[PDB]
Structures are given as C-alpha cells and as structure tokens.
Design a protein around this ligand. Sequence first.
Ligand SMILES: [Cl-]
Ligand SMILES: [Cl-]
Ligand SMILES: [Cl-]
Ligand SMILES: [Cl-]
Ligand SMILES: [Cl-]
Lengths: 159, 17
Amino acid sequence: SRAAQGRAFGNLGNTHYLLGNFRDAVIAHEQRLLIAKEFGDKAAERIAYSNLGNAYIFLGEFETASEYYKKTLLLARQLKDRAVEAQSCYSLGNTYTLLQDYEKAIDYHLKHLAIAQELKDRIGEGRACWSLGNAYTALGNHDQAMHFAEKHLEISREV
Amino acid sequence: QVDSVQRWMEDLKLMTE
Ligand SMILES: [Cl-]
Ligand SMILES: [Cl-]
Ligand SMILES: [Cl-]
Ligand SMILES: [Cl-]
Ligand SMILES: [Cl-]
C-alpha cells in the first residue's frame, strides 16, 4: 500500500533525523513528500517540507533549507495554520542569518513577531526580540535594536 | 556563532513533526 509506505517513510525520516542521520532523513522525507503529493495530503506535504528544511540546516545547506521553509510557509498560509506560519517564519529568519542576509532575516523575524503577539506566545515573542535585536545591531541600526533589547529584557523576566 | 541562532539550532535538533 502506497499510503502505508508514505506513513512509514515519514516515521523513518523522523527517526533518522533524531539519530543525527540527516542525509538518510532527507532521503526518507522526500519519499514521504512525493506520496503526500500523490494523495493530495496537504498536512503531510507541509510537515515533510518542514522536516526537510530542518535536515538541510544540519547538513549545512542553508540555501536549500530556505527553499523548503518557504514552501512550508506557503502551505501553512493556505491551511490557515498560524502557529506553523510563525514557526516557519522564525526558521527562515534564522536561516537567513546563517546566510548573512540580514535584510531577509529581519523580514521574516518581523513576520514571526507579529504572529507570536497575536497568538499570545510570550516565550516566542521573547525569542523574536532577541533575534531582532541581534540583527539590528549587526546592521548598526541602534534605535531599532534598542526597542527590541528593551522588550527582550522585559519578557526575559516573565517567561 | 550568533547566540540566538545557536539556541534555535539546539532546539531544532529535537524537533520533528
Ligand atoms: Cl518540492
Ligand atoms: Cl517550519
Ligand atoms: Cl513572505
Ligand atoms: Cl536604527
Ligand atoms: Cl513590538
């Protein structure tokens, strides 16, 4: 059964990933992804993009990771999944920092911030302020950095 | 390394869906 194989690949991919077998995680998640597309299973397709992006981070392939996180972001928006939209924006902000593309990093970190505030995810808001302060400082934008450094301090005391 | 990125990666190593 092709559907059972899709489940099995998704499970194998996750286990390889957690064992540090990132190459073999990619091989398995790609087959999960293909089978998800065959069956029109958008939930599984989205999940596979996110797990692929994560594996490529640990393979050091940051541009490839960004391509998979952009795919996850698109699908999360289509599915109206705000928490997953936020997660993929945070992963993109970090990925663009690894690529030393601070303008794109700031874009996606601001997107994550907005959703974390809407969702009352205060811990996530603190992460966003940490990340944004760091990025603005890397660029010399110290008035923006001040705003987010103050907010990181305030949140750091709460959660 | 950027400390916030390091932390994100430490969490990411444990993350699956
Ligand atoms: Cl694809
Ligand atoms: Cl993601
Ligand atoms: Cl976007
Ligand atoms: Cl500024
Ligand atoms: Cl704000």
